[PDB]
Design a binder for this molecule. Structure first.
Ligand SMILES: [Ca+2]
Ligand SMILES: [Ca+2]
Length: 266
């Protein structure tokens, strides 16, 4: 278990005397894919879409593989992922879009388009203001502030790469990585549990925003009863990440506390 494929792969791409991979270590590999793969060959003629594609794929790799959030990928993380399997499928499939995991170009396209849509001041960075000027209703400024606070890694600017993590997580709150993206945001004190105060702090803005729409919001007491019954935690007042992954309903939970649109759509 020290000389298997995952181990070799780390040795292959790591800097000398290193047993882990950073995002930068995946660049030569991804460049070699854009050059040689028939479904990405058209990117040779736009060597300026290279990075956005390469950066996007690398985000996706770390998003599902780097499960410790360390930023350094180990052979254990590789082993418990289907990444090498995907590389195998990558060599037999001429249509890159049929590779829905990591490499799909249409997947990258959608992400790049949404980044473009949001960058309202056109500076190629996503600010807190950019999100407010696109969609007043979707995400709460309190949850936005958490992201821009460094809860999921102040300059006040979100790069394109960090936006990838945001977009994937906002769209799909079912996969485990997304669940802890939002957990890190809601868990302000970092205690590993979502306290009543924390829950109250986020729900407070949801009430201000509903009342601004002429909608009478549900009182917190009744909300917490619906939510606690949905999660099925261990300890009554102590809601954990493990409880959220288990209940398979974390997306409804999360939207209730910081996404006004997706909440009203329920
Ligand atoms: Ca901007
Ligand atoms: Ca907490």
């Amino acid at each position: 278990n020290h000389h298997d494929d995952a181990s070799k792969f780390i040795c292959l791409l790591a800097k000398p005397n290193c047993s882990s991979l950073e995002q930068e270590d995946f660049i030569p590999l991804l460049q070699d894919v854009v050059d040689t793969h028939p479904g990405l060959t058209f990117l040779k003629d736009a060597p300026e879409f290279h990075s956005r594609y390469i950066t996007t794929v690398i985000q996706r790799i770390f998003y599902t593989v780097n499960r410790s959030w360390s930023g350094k990928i180990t052979s254990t993380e590789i082993r418990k992922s289907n990444f090498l399997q995907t590389l195998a499928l990558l060599e037999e499939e001429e249509d890159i879009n049929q590779i829905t995991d990591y490499f799909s170009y249409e997947h990258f396209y959608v992400i790049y388009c949404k980044f473009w849509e949001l960058d309202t001041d056109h500076d190629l960075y996503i600010s807190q203001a950019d999100l407010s000027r696109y969609n007043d209703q979707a995400s709460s400024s309190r949850i936005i502030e958490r992201i821009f606070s460094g809860a999921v890694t102040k300059e006040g600017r979100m790069s394109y790469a960090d936006f990838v993590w945001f977009l994937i997580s906002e769209e799909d709150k079912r996969n485990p990585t997304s669940i802890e993206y939002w957990f890190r945001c809601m868990d302000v004190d970092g205690d590993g549990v979502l306290s009543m105060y924390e829950l109250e702090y986020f729900y407070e803005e949801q009430c201000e925003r509903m009342e601004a729409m002429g909608i009478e919001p549900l009182p917190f007491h009744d909300l917490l009863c619906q939510m606690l019954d949905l999660v099925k935690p261990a300890v009554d007042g102590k809601i954990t990440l493990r409880d959220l992954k288990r209940c398979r309903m974390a997306h409804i939970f999360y939207d209730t506390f910081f996404n006004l649109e997706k909440y009203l759509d329920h």
